[PDB]
Design a protein around this ligand. Structure first.
Ligand code: AS4
Ligand code: NA
Ligand code: NA
Length: 244
């Protein structure tokens, strides 16, 4: 039922509104992705609010969690779309904006693009199911927290454990085979932190020099990044890992 609910609140595909008549310069590609991110942020916030348990958290905890995990959420979903639509060969940012070798090159962030493609490749290797993906995505929203704790810690812990259990349900082969899959899927979850660290570094860097580098960011993103950046830079957040 919880899983059936996740299927129901899963956001509909978001288009980039990309204009292919324009040259694919780094400035245009990055600005287009930032605009896409803004549109995706709207879907993310709406999705989170509809998530069983999220509403029970303090308003500040809700904002904090979205602020710290939006990049991981979008990168993970990108990995899923690329997996389903291109078997992990291209980055399916949006139906109207798919990154091939050429775009990855002109984006000036080829390596980060490959890091994200590696996620899709893991989905392929493990043949991640839609149910597993849905539960894992919720866990990402609940895997980067303030070092000083949350206001509704108790409720948070309970929520997190519920979705972890839901994930094991999706996984459920004998018990040892289920354990192995839990091990592998949570290894994938933990791997998101390092990738996201690199994604956020370039995001913050281009954000800080948005005007000078002519890389546009929509208001939906500017507000969030403006607040998130200092917190992250000061080392106020920490990951909730599944492995040593
Ligand atoms: C959210 C984003 C787009 C939507 C989506 O499906 C998946 C992602 C993940 C990668 C993200 C992009 C988008 O932020 C453009 C970037 C974020 O600013 C890059 C910039 O720094 C551009 O200035 C670095 C990391 C990129
Ligand atoms: Na908080
Ligand atoms: Na792989």
């Amino acid at each position: 039922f919880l899983i059936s609910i996740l299927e129901a609140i899963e956001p509909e595909v978001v288009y980039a509104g990309y204009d292919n008549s324009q040259p694919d310069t780094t400035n245009y590609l990055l600005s287009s992705l930032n605009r896409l991110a803004g549109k995706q942020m709207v879907s993310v916030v709406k999705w989170a609010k509809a998530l069983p348990g999220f509403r029970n958290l303090h308003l500040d905890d809700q904002m904090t969690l979205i602020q710290y995990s939006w990049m991981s959420l979008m990168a993970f979903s990108l990995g899923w779309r690329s997996y389903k639509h291109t078997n992990g060969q291209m980055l399916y940012f949006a139906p109207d904006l798919i990154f091939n070798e050429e775009r990855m090159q002109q984006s000036a962030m080829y390596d980060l693009c490959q890091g994200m493609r590696q996620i899709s490749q893991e989905f392929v290797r493990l043949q991640v199911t839609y149910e597993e993906f849905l539960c894992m995505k919720v866990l990402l929203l609940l895997s980067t927290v303030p070092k000083d704790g949350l206001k509704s810690q108790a409720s948070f812990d309970e929520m997190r454990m519920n979705y972890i259990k839901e994930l094991r349900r999706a996984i459920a082969n004998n018990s040892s085979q289920n354990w192995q899959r839990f091990y592998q899927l949570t290894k994938l979850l933990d791997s998101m932190h390092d990738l996201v660290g690199g994604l956020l570094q370039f995001c913050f860097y281009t954000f800080v020099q948005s005007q000078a580098l002519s890389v546009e960011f929509p208001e939906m993103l500017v507000e969030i990044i403006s607040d998130q950046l200092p917190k992250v830079m000061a080392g106020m957040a920490k990951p909730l890992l599944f492995h040593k």
